[PDB]
Write a structure and sequence with these properties.
Elements (H helix, E strand, L loop, with lengths): L19 E4 L12 E4 L1 H8 L7
Antiparallel strand pairs: 1-2
Length: about 55
């Protein structure tokens, strides 16, 4: 079970496939959250291939 879009995530590989990505945008205390699952294919992909390449 992966982390759905809009839900907070701690790890990067914790988020769903390339479809979603664990981004950590600014304004964590002033905004709504710190990191959550966001639509990022090319990102999560280019990232995973570099990090979660084995899994």
């Amino acid at each position: 079970a992966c982390i759905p879009r809009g839900e907070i995530c701690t790890d990067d590989c914790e988020c769903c496939g390339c479809d979603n990505q664990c981004y950590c945008p600014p304004g964590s205390s002033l905004g709504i959250f710190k990191c959550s699952c966001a639509h990022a294919n090319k990102y999560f992909c280019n990232r995973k291939k570099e990090k979660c390449k084995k899994a």
